[PDB]
């Protein structure tokens, strides 16, 4: 069924599973027209498909040309997402195909179910976790590849860098969701935290800085403080 805090260790068992987040597929800026009306301009988006055990991120870049001359784009975006996830599964060797796909938004259930009718043994599930994957475009190297794309493209990343050589998947996912939640809540302050110290850099082949184990503890504490600080500012606490 649905996925929540009771069965959270299930994410890190040995059954292949993918999260799918569609919140950055259809991205628009709203602006005023010369006649004083309002118009949207689309910008490139992406599907965020993540294996939470391994860190493998299948980032399908959605180029604005896919919306040309289409209507009801917010609806189409869900079906385009389902089409692309189905295509990804079919491209994977059988032993790499997921046994479950967990969608972050329940509106993705029917589109994905219909596209995956040929895979009756892949479970399509919602989750009751509120996951901050919309903030993926706050990761500079992900945002850069999406905005520079001139055509549809799939790019593969490991969103955990090399952390799984020093920590468990459970801990890596918890670190990722804390980082993304902080970037979602206050992007400027989170990036300041991550880059404040010039002597710690991001390797060419990584997304995040090369923190030692002790520095990650400090960083994680500063991210928790940011989230709590912002909660106090929001609710006047």
């Amino acid at each position: 069924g649905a996925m929540n805090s009771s069965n959270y260790a299930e994410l890190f068992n040995n059954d292949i599973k993918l999260f799918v987040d569609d919140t950055n597929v259809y991205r628009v800026t709203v602006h005023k027209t010369f006649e004083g009306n309002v118009a949207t301009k689309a910008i490139n988006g992406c599907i965020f498909t993540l294996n939470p055990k391994t860190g493998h991120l299948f980032l399908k870049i959605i180029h604005t040309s896919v919306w040309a001359g289409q209507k009801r784009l917010s609806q189409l975006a869900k079906w385009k997402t389902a089409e692309e996830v189905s295509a990804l599964v079919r491209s994977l060797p059988k032993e790499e195909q997921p046994k479950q796909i967990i969608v972050t938004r329940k509106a993705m259930l029917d589109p994905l179910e219909v596209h995956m009718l040929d895979f009756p043994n892949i479970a399509i599930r919602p989750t009751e976790l509120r996951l901050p994957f919309s903030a993926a475009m706050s990761i500079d190297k992900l945002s850069d590849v999406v905005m520079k794309a001139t055509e549809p493209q799939m790019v593969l990343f490991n969103i955990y860098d090399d952390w799984l050589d020093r920590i468990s998947s459970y801990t890596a996912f918890s670190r990722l969701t804390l980082l993304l939640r902080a970037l979602k809540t206050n992007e400027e302050s989170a990036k300041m935290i991550l880059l404040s110290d010039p002597t710690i850099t991001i390797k060419s082949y990584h997304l995040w800085p090369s923190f030692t184990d002790e520095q990650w503890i400090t960083i994680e504490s500063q991210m928790r403080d940011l989230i709590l600080t912002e909660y106090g500012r929001k609710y006047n606490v």
């Binding site: 079906w79 389902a82 089409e83 029917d110 589109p111 219909v114 596209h115 009718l117 040929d118």
Partner: protein
């Protein structure tokens, strides 16, 4: 006009014949139903006074044989049987009529209700949904499951309605996923009408039969089928105009006949609100929308 005689009435029972019903007391001198209109299928149905569990009954057409009812004290029910001795049968009916031991099918001359509910229902199609090939009449009861219900348990006692499933490969062309899920015209017109039913008359016959089994027996799987067949049409952008007009007439008479106090259990709020107010055909069911709003405004 034809006659279904009863050997006797040994247990107190409410007897239905089509949309009519009457009570018979234990061992009362009741010997059947006369003046049954030729030209329509009919259903004779039963609910025991001492055990309202199991409504059950028999679909039949008096043009296909001489049928009668006899109580079986071992299986505990009124059974329909066919009498092959025509002269014996006529002699029995004539005697019971002479002694005025039969009730008259109480049809008002002005009243087209039964025709309107069974316009497309034929015995041959009933006998393909209800499989018991040795009888010319068909038994249905409140508990019988449908083939689709048995996929999600005795196959010989099942209602073989046409399976409709909106999230199935039959309903959804590879490569037309969004199109076919949001607009069911492919599934309605190519798969169901052209492919399975052959024409809209057979589709409407099964829809009408499902409704009547839902209403007369409280058969839950029949109610599911009735609503699925409505939703398939309403959720299709492309439907032959004659079908939309005729569906409106069909549903009007069904809603008109439904017992008011059974509406909570025989009508699916989601399906009706979607069909009347959100679907492609939301503006094509004027008569049905009018009676629904005046008779069941709560459901909406």
């Amino acid at each position: 006009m034809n006659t279904v005689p009863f050997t006797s009435a040994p247990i107190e029972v409410t007897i239905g014949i089509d949309q009519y019903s009457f009570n018979v007391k234990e061992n009362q001198p009741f010997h059947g139903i006369k003046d049954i209109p030729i030209g329509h299928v009919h259903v004779i149905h039963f609910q025991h006074a001492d055990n309202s569990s199991m409504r059950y009954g028999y679909w039949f057409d008096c043009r296909m044989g001489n049928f009668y009812i006899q109580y079986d004290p071992k299986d505990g029910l009124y059974k329909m049987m066919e009498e092959r001795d025509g002269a014996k049968f006529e002699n029995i009916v004539h005697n019971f009529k002479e002694r005025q031991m039969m009730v008259s099918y109480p049809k008002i001359d002005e009243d087209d209700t039964w025709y309107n509910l069974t316009e497309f229902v034929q015995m041959d199609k009933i006998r393909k949904i209800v499989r018991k090939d040795e009888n010319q009449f068909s038994y249905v009861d409140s508990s019988m499951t449908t083939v689709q219900e048995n996929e999600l348990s005795d196959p010989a006692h099942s209602l073989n309605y046409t399976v409709i499933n909106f999230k199935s490969r039959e309903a959804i062309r590879p490569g037309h996923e969004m199109e076919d899920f949001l607009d069911k015209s492919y599934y309605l017109n190519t798969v169901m009408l052209q492919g399975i039913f052959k024409n809209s008359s057979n589709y409407f016959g099964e829809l009408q039969f499902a409704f009547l089994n839902a209403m007369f027996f409280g058969n839950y799987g029949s109610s599911l089928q009735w609503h699925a067949m409505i939703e398939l049409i309403c959720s299709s952008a492309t439907v032959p105009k004659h079908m939309l007009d005729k569906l409106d007439e069909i549903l009007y008479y069904q809603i008109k006949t439904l017992p008011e106090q059974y509406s909570d259990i025989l009508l699916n709020e989601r399906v009706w609100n979607i069909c009347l107010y959100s679907s492609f055909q939301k503006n094509s069911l004027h008569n049905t929308e009018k009676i629904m709003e005046n008779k069941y405004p709560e459901l909406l």
